[PDB]
Design an enzyme around this catalytic site. Structure first.
Site, PDB file in Angstrom:
ATOM      1  N   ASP A 142       0.820  -1.195   0.000  1.00 42.62           N
ATOM      2  CA  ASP A 142       0.000   0.000   0.000  1.00 42.62           C
ATOM      3  C   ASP A 142       0.862   1.255   0.000  1.00 42.62           C
ATOM      4  OD1 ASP A 142      -1.928   1.889   0.279  1.00 42.62           O
ATOM      5  OD2 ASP A 142      -2.705   1.136   2.190  1.00 42.62           O
ATOM      6  N   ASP A 153      -4.201   7.133  -3.260  1.00 45.41           N
ATOM      7  CA  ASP A 153      -4.093   6.088  -2.247  1.00 45.41           C
ATOM      8  C   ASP A 153      -4.647   4.822  -2.904  1.00 45.41           C
ATOM      9  OD1 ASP A 153      -5.360   5.740   1.194  1.00 45.41           O
ATOM     10  OD2 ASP A 153      -3.846   4.645   0.058  1.00 45.41           O
ATOM     11  N   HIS A 230      -6.538  11.867   5.050  1.00 47.28           N
ATOM     12  CA  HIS A 230      -7.891  11.621   5.541  1.00 47.28           C
ATOM     13  C   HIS A 230      -8.590  12.964   5.773  1.00 47.28           C
ATOM     14  CE1 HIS A 230     -10.669   9.349   8.599  1.00 47.28           C
ATOM     15  NE2 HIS A 230     -11.322  10.258   7.896  1.00 47.28           N
ATOM     16  N   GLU A 255     -11.355   1.341   0.237  1.00 46.28           N
ATOM     17  CA  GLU A 255     -10.558   0.172   0.595  1.00 46.28           C
ATOM     18  C   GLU A 255     -11.298  -0.749   1.548  1.00 46.28           C
ATOM     19  OE1 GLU A 255      -8.122   3.088   3.608  1.00 46.28           O
ATOM     20  OE2 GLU A 255      -7.044   1.345   2.843  1.00 46.28           O
ATOM     21  N   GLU A 350      -7.516  -1.471  -2.543  1.00 44.52           N
ATOM     22  CA  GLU A 350      -7.913  -0.073  -2.433  1.00 44.52           C
ATOM     23  C   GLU A 350      -7.735   0.734  -3.711  1.00 44.52           C
ATOM     24  OE1 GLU A 350      -7.069   3.541   0.791  1.00 44.52           O
ATOM     25  OE2 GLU A 350      -5.530   2.054   0.347  1.00 44.52           O
TER      26      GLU A 350
HETATM   27  C1  LIG Z   1      -0.154   6.832   8.517  1.00 43.00           C
HETATM   28  C2  LIG Z   1      -0.848   7.910   7.663  1.00 43.00           C
HETATM   29  C3  LIG Z   1      -2.327   7.632   7.442  1.00 43.00           C
HETATM   30  C4  LIG Z   1      -3.308   8.330   8.242  1.00 43.00           C
HETATM   31  C5  LIG Z   1      -4.712   8.095   8.062  1.00 43.00           C
HETATM   32  C6  LIG Z   1      -5.188   7.151   7.078  1.00 43.00           C
HETATM   33  N1  LIG Z   1      -6.553   6.928   6.908  1.00 43.00           N
HETATM   34  S1  LIG Z   1      -7.547   6.074   7.884  1.00 43.00           S
HETATM   35  O1  LIG Z   1      -7.342   6.603   9.223  1.00 43.00           O
HETATM   36  O2  LIG Z   1      -8.868   6.181   7.336  1.00 43.00           O
HETATM   37  C7  LIG Z   1      -7.026   4.397   7.815  1.00 43.00           C
HETATM   38  C8  LIG Z   1      -6.206   3.876   8.838  1.00 43.00           C
HETATM   39  C9  LIG Z   1      -5.780   2.533   8.784  1.00 43.00           C
HETATM   40  C10 LIG Z   1      -6.181   1.735   7.704  1.00 43.00           C
HETATM   41  F1  LIG Z   1      -5.775   0.472   7.661  1.00 43.00           F
HETATM   42  C11 LIG Z   1      -7.001   2.231   6.668  1.00 43.00           C
HETATM   43  C12 LIG Z   1      -7.428   3.580   6.727  1.00 43.00           C
HETATM   44  C13 LIG Z   1      -4.220   6.432   6.262  1.00 43.00           C
HETATM   45  C14 LIG Z   1      -4.646   5.449   5.244  1.00 43.00           C
HETATM   46  O3  LIG Z   1      -5.379   5.893   4.213  1.00 43.00           O
HETATM   47  O4  LIG Z   1      -4.364   4.297   5.371  1.00 43.00           O
HETATM   48  C15 LIG Z   1      -2.795   6.678   6.441  1.00 43.00           C
HETATM   49  C16 LIG Z   1      -1.764   5.920   5.567  1.00 43.00           C
HETATM   50 MN   LIG Z   2      -6.456   4.537   2.617  1.00 43.02          MN
HETATM   51 MN   LIG Z   3      -3.842   2.897   1.445  1.00 42.29          MN
END
Ligand SMILES: CCc1ccc(NS(=O)(=O)c2ccc(F)cc2)c(C(=O)O)c1C
Ligand SMILES: [Mn+2]
Ligand SMILES: [Mn+2]
Length: 369
Positions: A142, A153, A230, A255, A350
């Site tokens: 990812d 993303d 986000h 995702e 995703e």
């Molecule tokens: C580590 C940085 C980050 C912050 C928030 C979210 N988004 S979230 O909080 O919606 C989230 C968290 C964990 C996950 F596995 C999916 C989505 C993500 C992401 O899109 O994965 C990342 C990479």
């Molecule tokens: Mn994501």
């Molecule tokens: Mn992602």
């Protein structure tokens, strides 16, 4: 003018006209009264609204094409025996060249996640991690690219043992179901249920045990903002539904995660992901090391997520305490790996979609998935 076997030509120089390839364009899903959405496909008002934000859609596309070519390249060489570090560094080296990394104008949106087995997301190796990809591992690749903060993303799951095929399909299908179900005025909770019905309609057999695929209930999709992974709205994956509808112009990361464990993740292992709180303002820091580290973060990452390795590569050393300070001060938020019960397996698919006025575009879509 043509990409090279081992990708080296920036997506930039491949489309000199400055116009990049569009993703899969879909007609918005109808509603109650079979409310068709073919009226937006060419409405006069919408077409003007769409072409209005054309330079933005175009940026998302430049990043998406980067994502597609990079991952196509990763699937050709990712193999067990390689260390997670070799993998991430090889992937990131390509991702930097095709996106033509330029400070905060072009580059990697967030660290290369390659969570293994029971860990679903947010795991990327820190210096010294000797972990080696195994034949029985289920690894979620990812990573993200961005142009002027327009974040792509997108992720997929990698396996080598065919015993996970049906688990990956269950999840891949769950993701597409949410993508097809998503749309302007569509309620988040509804996208969640849809995703669950499909995900759970799959049953798999792995090493003599049978399981009904479970969506990781405390995980989910989300809306996307400029330089903000986000934006604020979350995409369920289960039954609840915050209290919101997707809106025209928005951008979402659709995702889904499937698991054989308890369908719930928790913080585990050592943290490698960190990100400046998009909301926190300017905080004067006199403590030298903490002041310096924060400056590096503002200069190199802004509000984009980063990892320890990325601090390493910049020549930063002895920065953990200072990083802790930034974290305790609430200027930076830690994002530890999210893992399910030990022994469980998890898969993820995703895509980033654009809720444009005339249509729904799955910009990060490709031949692979
Ligand atoms: C580590 C940085 C980050 C912050 C928030 C979210 N988004 S979230 O909080 O919606 C989230 C968290 C964990 C996950 F596995 C999916 C989505 C993500 C992401 O899109 O994965 C990342 C990479
Ligand atoms: Mn994501
Ligand atoms: Mn992602």
């Amino acid at each position: 003018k043509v990409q090279t076997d081992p990708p080296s030509v920036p997506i930039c120089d491949l489309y000199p006209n400055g116009v990049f390839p569009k993703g899969q364009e879909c007609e918005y899903p109808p509603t109650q009264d079979g409310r068709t959405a073919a009226w937006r496909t060419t409405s006069e008002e919408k077409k003007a609204l769409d072409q209005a934000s054309e330079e933005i859609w175009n940026d998302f596309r430049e990043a998406a094409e980067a994502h597609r070519q990079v991952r196509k390249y990763v699937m050709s060489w990712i193999k067990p025996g390689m260390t997670m570090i070799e993998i991430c560094e090889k992937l990131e080296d390509c991702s930097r060249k095709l996106i033509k990394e330029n400070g905060l104008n072009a580059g990697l949106a967030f660290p290369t996640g390659c969570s293994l087995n029971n860990c679903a997301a947010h795991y990327t190796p820190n210096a010294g991690d000797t972990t080696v990809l195994q034949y029985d591992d289920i690894c979620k690749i990812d990573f993200g690219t961005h142009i002027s903060g327009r974040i792509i993303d997108c992720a997929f799951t990698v396996t080598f043992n065919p015993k996970y095929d049906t688990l990956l399909k269950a999840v891949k299908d769950a993701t597409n179901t949410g993508i097809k179900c998503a749309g302007i005025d569509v309620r988040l909770c509804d996208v969640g249920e849809a995703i669950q019905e499909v995900m759970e309609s799959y049953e798999v057999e792995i090493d003599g045990k049978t399981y009904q695929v479970k969506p990781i209930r405390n995980l989910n999709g989300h809306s996307i903002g400029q330089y903000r992974i986000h934006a604020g709205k979350t995409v369920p994956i289960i039954k609840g539904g915050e209290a919101t509808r997707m809106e025209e112009g928005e951008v979402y990361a659709i995702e889904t995660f499937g698991s054989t464990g308890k369908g719930v993740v928790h913080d585990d292992m050592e943290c490698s992901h960190y990100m400046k709180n998009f909301d926190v303002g300017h905080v004067p820091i006199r403590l030298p090391r903490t002041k310096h580290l924060l400056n590096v973060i503002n200069e190199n990452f802004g509000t984009l997520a980063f990892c320890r390795r990325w601090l390493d590569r910049l020549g930063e050393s002895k920065y953990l305490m200072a990083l802790k300070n930034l974290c305790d001060l609430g200027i930076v938020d830690p994002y530890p790996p999210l893992c399910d019960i030990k022994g469980s397996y998890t898969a993820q698919f995703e895509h980033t979609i654009l809720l444009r006025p005339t249509c729904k575009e799955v910009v990060s879509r490709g031949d692979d998935y």
